[PDB]
Design a protein around this ligand. Structure first.
Ligand code: PCW
Ligand code: PCW
Ligand code: PCW
Ligand code: PCW
Ligand code: ZN
Ligand code: ZN
Lengths: 48, 505, 146, 48
C-alpha cells in the first residue's frame, strides 16, 4: 500500500536509482543503492 | 498457413528478442486470423446479377492468384522460346528488318496470341493481388497505427520523426470516418479519446481524430435514420476520398504491388517491341523457391559485395595513377608504328583501360601492357604487375567468393539453430525438454497438447469472435489483458506440471 | 551387364565400366555425395546462368550486332548476332568459357558511339556470369562438404 | 571464424550472466527472471 501511494515519486526517481549486488563484509550478498546522475546516464546512452 | 508459421518461427528465433517474443507471437496470430477470414470470404459457396457475377469473378481470381502467376511465367517462357527463332536482314521478308525465320508459318500468329494472353494474365494477376494480399497490408498498417495511437500517443504526446515517411503519410487517415476498415477493433478512436483526453484536451483529441462528441450524444439521445435508395449517386457520396487516397498511397508503396505493376508495364511494352518480353524471364527468381533461396545467398551479404566492388575500383584507380605517372610508354595498343594508340596519355582513358581490361585479364594488367624486359624500370614494373595480380585478381575476387560461401554457411547455421531451439525448449514457457521428458514422450505431449501454438492462436480467434457478454471469468480476464496488450497471462518458466508437481506425481 | 555385352560389339563400350569407381570406392562415393548433396541447387544455378546469358544475348542482338564478326577476311563475314539462335549459342558456348567473358571474344569497342554502353555490357557480363554464378557453384559444393 | 566468434559472444550473453556467471535457466524460474536479473540486479552499467 505504501508503494502504491509513493508510485509517483518512485516513477520519477526510477532512472536515477542505481542498485548493485556485492559480497559484503557480512559474508552475504548485499544490495547497495545509490544515485546516478542525469549527465552520467546521458553520457552512457551516447552511441560511441 | 504452414509456410507462414515456419517463417514466423524462423524470424522470432533468429532476429527476435525475449521481451518482444509474445508481442510478435500475438501479432502473428492476429495476421493469421485475418488471413483465415479472407480465405473464408473468397472460398466458393440486372444490377444484382452483375454484382454477384463480379464478386464471383474476383473470388475466383483471388483463389487462383498463384496459378495465374505460374501461367504468366509459362507464357513468358513460351514467348521467349519463339523469340529464339528471330532473325535480322537488310531486305524485307540502310534500314534493317527483324522478323521470325520459321518454316511451318504458325509461329507469328502463335507469338501474337501468346503475347495478348500474357498481357491479360498480368492484368488478372494485378487484380488478384489487389483482392487477396492488399487487405492484409492495409490490416497490418491500420493495426500498427491504432496501437501507436493508443499506447504511444504518436500524434498526441509525441510526433513522427519527420524523416519517417510512414508516420507523415498516416497523418492523413486519422480523421477519416472509416480509418479502421480492415482492423477489427472499432473502438480505437474512443479508446484513444478516453486515454489521452484529459492531459491533452478532449476537444483537441476529437478534432485530431475526426469525431464529434455532441453528435455522439445527440445520436444516443434520439434516433434519426434517413436511408436513400441505393444508387450510383448515393455510392459516390458514400466513398471516402481521404481514406482512399491514403490507402492507394500505401498500396503503391507496397513492394509486391510495385513488382506486379512493373510486370504489367513490361508486358504492355512487349507489344511495342516483342523483345521486352525477355524481361519477364527475370520472374524465375521470385517464382521458383530454390532459385529464391540461392539468390538470397547472394543478397545476404549484398552490402559487403558492393563495398568490395568499390574497394576494387579504388585500388585500380591507385594503380592507374601510378601507371599514368611512371609507366606511360608501355600502354601502346597499336601495332602499326605510324599511328600509336596510347591508353595512359590521359587519366580518364587509362582508368577505363585498367578497370575494363586488367580486371578481366587472367594475369592482370601485365597480360595486356607491353613486355618490360630490358628496361630501366623493369623491376619496378614487374613489381607493379605482380602486386596488381595478387591484390586485384587473387585477393579481392577471393573476398567476393568468400562472401558468397559465408552467406551459404550462415543461412545453414541459422536454420540449424532454429531447429535445435524448437527441439530443445518450449516456444511458449521456455522450459527445457529435459524436464518434460521425465514422463514418456513428455516434451512431445507438452508441445502438442499443453502449450500448443495453434491452440493459443485458436483461443485468440475464439475470444475475438465470442461476444463479450458471453465471456466466462477466465475468458474475461484474458480478454481484458489482451485489450491492454499485457502478455503476463502467457506462462513463462511455468506450466501446469510444475505448478502441481507434487499432486500430479 | 548390357554395357559388357555391347563391349563385344565395340570394345570401347568397356570404357563405360570405369564409371563404376563411383559406386565401388567408398572415398569416391563420399566425395561425389558432396556434389550430389546440393545437386538440385546446382541444376537450378545452371538454369539461372542460361537465363542470364539469354538476356545478354537479347541485348547484344538488339544493339551490338556489328561487334560479332568472327571472320578475318573482309570478303566473307561470319556474324554471330545475325540471328537470335546463333548468337545465343555463341554466347553460351564461348562467352561462358572465356576467362573475361564475352568481351574477350567480340570486337574491341574503342572509339565507338556505343563504347561506354558496350564496356558496361562486358563488365557486367564478367561480374555476374564469370565471377558470381561460378562462385555460387563453388559455394554450393563447399557448403555441401561443411 | 569471425562469424563464429560473434555468434559465441551472442550465445554467452544470452545464456549466462556476465557478472555472476549463473545460467539463465535458474533465473527464468520467475517470469522474465533472467531479463530482470541482467537489467536491475547485476547490471554492468550500474556497476560502472
Ligand atoms: C525489377 C527490375 C526493374 C528494372 C527492369 C529494367 C528493364 C530493362 C528495360 C527498359 C526500360 C523501360 C522503359 C524503356 C521504354 C523505351 C521505349 C523503347 O525502347 O523504344 C525504342 C526501341 C523500340 O523498338 P523499335 O524502335 O525497333 O520499334 C518497334 C515498333 N515500331 C517499329 C513501332 C516503331 O527499344 C527496343 O527496341 C528494345 C529492344 C529490347 C531491349 C531488351 C529488353 C530487356 C531485356 C533484358 C534486360 C534485362 C535488364 C534487367 C535489369 C537488371 C535487374 C537485376
Ligand atoms: C592495396 C594496396 C594498393 C596498391 C596501390 C598501388 C600499388 C602500385 C605499386 C608499385 C609500383 C612500384 C614502382 C613505383 C615507381 C617506379 C618509378 C621510379 O621508381 O622512378 C624513379 C622516380 C624518378 O622520377 P621521374 O623523373 O621518372 O618522374 C618524376 C615526375 N613525373 C613522375 C610525372 C614525371 O623517382 C620519383 O619520382 C619518386 C616518386 C615517388 C614514388 C611514389 C610511388 C609510390 C607507389 C607505391 C608505393 C608502394 C609500392 C611497392 C609495394 C607494393 C604495394 C603493397
Ligand atoms: C547408369 C548410368 C547410365 C549412363 C551412361 C549410359 C551409357 C552411354 C552410352 C551408350 C548407349 C549405347 C546405346 C546404343 C548402342 C547401339 C550400338 C552402337 O552404338 O554401334 C555403333 C558404334 C559401334 O561401332 P562400329 O559401328 O564400328 O561396329 C563395330 C563392329 N562391326 C565392325 C560389327 C561393324 O558405336 C560406337 O562405336 C561406340 C564407341 C564407344 C562410345 C563411348 C562409350 C562410352 C564411353 C564413355 C561415356 C560414358 C557415358 C557417361 C555419361 C553419363 C554419366 C553421368
Ligand atoms: C541478373 C541481371 C541480368 C542482366 C541482364 C542483361 C543486362 C545487360 C546490360 C547492359 C548493356 C547497356 C547498354 C544497353 C543499351 C545500349 C544501346 C543504346 O543505348 O542505344 C540507344 C537507343 C537508340 O535507339 P535506336 O536508334 O538504336 O533503336 C533501337 C531499335 N532496335 C533496338 C532494334 C534497332 O535507345 C533505345 O533504343 C532505348 C531502348 C531501351 C533500352 C533497353 C536496354 C536495357 C538493358 C539493360 C538494363 C540496364 C543495363 C545496365 C544495368 C546493368 C545490369 C545490372
Ligand atoms: Zn511450455
Ligand atoms: Zn548475475
Amino acid at each position: 500500500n505504501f508503494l502504491e501511494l509513493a508510485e509517483s515519486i518512485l516513477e520519477y526517481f526510477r532512472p536515477y536509482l542505481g542498485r548493485i549486488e556485492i559480497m559484503g563484509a557480512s559474508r552475504r550478498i548485499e544490495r547497495i543503492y545509490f544515485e546516478i546522475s542525469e549527465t552520467n546516464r546521458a553520457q552512457w546512452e551516447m552511441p560511441q | 498457413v504452414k509456410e507462414s508459421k515456419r517463417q514466423f518461427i524462423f524470424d522470432v528465433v533468429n532476429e527476435g528478442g525475449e521481451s518482444e517474443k509474445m508481442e510478435m507471437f500475438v501479432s502473428f496470430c492476429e495476421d493469421t486470423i485475418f488471413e483465415m477470414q479472407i480465405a473464408a470470404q473468397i472460398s466458393e459457396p440486372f444490377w444484382g446479377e452483375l454484382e454477384v457475377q463480379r464478386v464471383k469473378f474476383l473470388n475466383y481470381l483471388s483463389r487462383n492468384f498463384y496459378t495465374l502467376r505460374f501461367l504468366a511465367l509459362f507464357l513468358a517462357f513460351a514467348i521467349n522460346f519463339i523469340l529464339l527463332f528471330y532473325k535480322v536482314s537488310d531486305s524485307p521478308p540502310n534500314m534493317v528488318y527483324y522478323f521470325l525465320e520459321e518454316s511451318t508459318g504458325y509461329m507469328e500468329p502463335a507469338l501474337r496470341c501468346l503475347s495478348l494472353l500474357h498481357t491479360l494474365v498480368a492484368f488478372l494477376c494485378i487484380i488478384g493481388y489487389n483482392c487477396l494480399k492488399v487487405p492484409l497490408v492495409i490490416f497490418k498498417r491500420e493495426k500498427e497505427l491504432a496501437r501507436k495511437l493508443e499506447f504511444d500517443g504518436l500524434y498526441i504526446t509525441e510526433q513522427p520523426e519527420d524523416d519517417d515517411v510512414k508516420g507523415q503519410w498516416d497523418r492523413l487517415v486519422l480523421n477519416t470516418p472509416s480509418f479502421p476498415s480492415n482492423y477489427w477493433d472499432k473502438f480505437v478512436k474512443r479508446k484513444v479519446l478516453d486515454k489521452h483526453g484529459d492531459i491533452f484536451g478532449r476537444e483537441r483529441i476529437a478534432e485530431l481524430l475526426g469525431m464529434d462528441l455532441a453528435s455522439l450524444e445527440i445520436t444516443a439521445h434520439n434516433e434519426r435514420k434517413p436511408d436513400p435508395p441505393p444508387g450510383l449517386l448515393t455510392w459516390i457520396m458514400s466513398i471516402d476520398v481521404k481514406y482512399q487516397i491514403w490507402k492507394f498511397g500505401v498500396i503503391f508503396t507496397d513492394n509486391s504491388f510495385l513488382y506486379l505493376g512493373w510486370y504489367m508495364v513490361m508486358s504492355l511494352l512487349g507489344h511495342y517491341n516483342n523483345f521486352f518480353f525477355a524481361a519477364h524471364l527475370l520472374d524465375i527468381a521470385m517464382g521458383v523457391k530454390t532459385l529464391r533461396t540461392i539468390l538470397s545467398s547472394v543478397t545476404h551479404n549484398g552490402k559487403q559485395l558492393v563495398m568490395t566492388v568499390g574497394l576494387l575500383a579504388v585500388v585500380v584507380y591507385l594503380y592507374t595513377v601510378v601507371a599514368f605517372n611512371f609507366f606511360r610508354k608501355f600502354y601502346n595498343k597499336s601495332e602499326d608504328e605510324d599511328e600509336p594508340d596510347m591508353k595512359c596519355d590521359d587519366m580518364m582513358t587509362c582508368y577505363l583501360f585498367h578497370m575494363y581490361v586488367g580486371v578481366r585479364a587472367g594475369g592482370g594488367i601485365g597480360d595486356e601492357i607491353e613486355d618490360p624486359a630490358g628496361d630501366e624500370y623493369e623491376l619496378y614494373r614487374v613489381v607493379f604487375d605482380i602486386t596488381f595480380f595478387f591484390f586485384v585478381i587473387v585477393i579481392l575476387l577471393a573476398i567476393i567468393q568468400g562472401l558468397i560461401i559465408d552467406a551459404f554457411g550462415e543461412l545453414r547455421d541459422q536454420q540449424e539453430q532454429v531447429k535445435e531451439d524448437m527441439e530443445t525448449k518450449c516456444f511458449i514457457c521456455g522450459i527445457g525438454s529435459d524436464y518434460f521428458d521425465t514422463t514418456p514422450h513428455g516434451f512431445e505431449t507438452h508441445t502438442l497438447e499443453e502449450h500448443n501454438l495453434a491452440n493459443y492462436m485458436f483461443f485468440l480467434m475464439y475470444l475475438i469472435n465470442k461476444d463479450e457478454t458471453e465471456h466466462t471469468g477466465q475468458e474475461s480476464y484474458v480478454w481484458k489483458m489482451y485489450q491492454e496488450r499485457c502478455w503476463d497471462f502467457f506462462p513463462a518458466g511455468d506450466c501446469f506440471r510444475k505448478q502441481y508437481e507434487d499432486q500430479l506425481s
